[PDB]
Specification:
This protein has one domain. It is built from two helices and no strands. This is Golgi resident protein GCP60. It comes from Homo sapiens. It is found in: Golgi apparatus membrane; Mitochondrion. The PDB classes it as unknown function.
Amino acid sequence: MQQKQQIMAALNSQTAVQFQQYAAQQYPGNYEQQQILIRQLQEQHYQQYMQQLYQVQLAQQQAALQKQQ
C-alpha cells in the first residue's frame, strides 16, 4: 500500500506554526492566502524530504555492505 500521504500529514503538523510565521510576513492580514502559501511550502518541502530519503537509503545500504572503510 502507498503510504505517501501519511508523511505529508506528519510534516503538516511539524511545520504548521513554523510556516505560519513566514506566511504572515508575506501575506499579512490575509489568513486565506497565508494558508495557500503554507500548503505550497509543505509540498516543496516534500520534494526535499524525498531527496533526503534517497541519501538515507544509500546510507543504510553501505552500512550493510561495509565494502569501504
